[PDB]
């Protein structure tokens, strides 16, 4: 086990593989409540499964960080927490719905 | 009725017969470089600063004096057009005096401004 993650305020995780399986599984369950054809569901399920496959395949924490390519394993866990929080918020926002409103005629015309 | 179709950089524009190449370009918002041409004077065609390439035509035409023809595509930003302007500007500045600091035209001079742009 590492002595430190090197980032102030990010504590070393005793059981990183177990924590990552729990978080990715929670993300996938939350994604199951998003509409099937929503792009957020399709892309996030795709990337979440890929990371989950690496977590199962590779038991060595040093080697797992090499595959995931997302920093320290504690940075990966934090990112999975962030994604899980985002998924819950996306359900209430529902950004897969059509555009709320077109902008005025030349709102984005530069130069004027 | 009698409008003929020409193209400016591939954009179609309908003009009356007798419209010049220079006037056809104005209808799409482009201003051809000029010195001798003035819309209220008779056409001269001597400065040669308005030379412009007609697509698939070997020779550049004086846009101010050349009537357009049906189907012509006027390449107003072509490599041939741009190199014609550079040559003409170079001849204009060969004998011109280094006077801009003492010349009243400085700052509102078409020679200065078209040298900068073309």
């Amino acid at each position: 086990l590492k002595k430190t993650t090197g980032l102030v305020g990010l504590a070393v995780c005793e059981t990183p593989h177990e924590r990552l399986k729990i978080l990715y599984t929670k993300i996938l369950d939350v994604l199951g409540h998003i509409p099937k054809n929503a792009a957020y569901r399709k892309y996030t399920e795709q990337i979440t499964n890929e990371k989950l496959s690496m977590v199962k395949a590779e038991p060595d924490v040093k080697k797992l960080e090499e595959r995931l390519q997302g920093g320290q394993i504690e940075e990966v866990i934090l990112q999975a927490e962030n994604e899980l929080s985002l998924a819950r918020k996306m359900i209430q926002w529902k950004p897969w719905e059509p555009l709320v409103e077109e902008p005025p005629a030349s709102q984005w015309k530069w130069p004027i | 009725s009698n409008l003929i179709e020409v193209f400016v950089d591939g954009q179609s524009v309908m003009v009356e017969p007798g419209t010049t190449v220079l006037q056809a370009c104005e209808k799409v918002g482009m201003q051809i470089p000029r010195f001798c041409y003035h819309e209220r004077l008779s056409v001269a065609g001597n400065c040669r600063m308005c030379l412009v390439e007609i697509e698939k035509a070997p020779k550049v035409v004086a846009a101010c004096a050349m009537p357009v023809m049906k189907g012509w595509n006027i390449l107003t930003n072509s490599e041939k057009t741009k190199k014609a302007r550079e040559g003409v500007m170079e001849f204009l500045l060969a004998n011109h005096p280094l006077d801009c600091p003492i010349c009243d035209q400085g700052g509102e001079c078409d020679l200065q401004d078209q040298s900068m742009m073309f």
Binding site: - | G18, T20, R40, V43, A65, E108, D110, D113
Partner: protein, 125 residues
């Protein structure tokens, strides 16, 4: 949720502009005339808003041109006449609008210089 506000937009009390420089001023909405010293037409493309000219006097010390008019240099650019008018309405300024002056299309003919029987024939090239 949205609300219905059935008034003309008016922001003069939330712009910070002093009373004097809202109702005594006269904005002019126009397209600038081509500088007749040059043939380029690129400065005649946009609409401008400018205010009425006020006094400029000579500084006693150096003779510089002094001003008490905060809007002397204020010039605004607009894409269309409607945009300029809408900006003046909501700011409370009295304005005068002037139609854009586009040059007339001319009939040009190089061959007219050599007419057999017309006066357009030139005597020199």
């Amino acid at each position: 949720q949205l609300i219905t506000v059935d008034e003309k937009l008016d922001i003069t009390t939330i712009t910070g502009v002093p009373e004097e420089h809202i109702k005594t001023r006269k904005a002019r909405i126009f397209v600038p005339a081509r500088n007749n010293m040059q043939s380029g037409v690129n400065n005649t493309k946009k609409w401008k808003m400018e205010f009425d000219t006020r006094e400029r006097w000579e500084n006693p010390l150096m003779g510089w041109a002094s001003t008490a008019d905060p809007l002397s240099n204020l010039v605004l650019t607009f894409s269309t006449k409607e945009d300029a008018v809408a900006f003046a309405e909501k700011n409370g300024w009295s304005y005068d609008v002037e139609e854009r002056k586009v040059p007339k299309p001319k009939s040009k003919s190089y061959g007219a210089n050599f007419s057999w029987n017309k006066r357009t024939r030139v005597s020199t090239k």
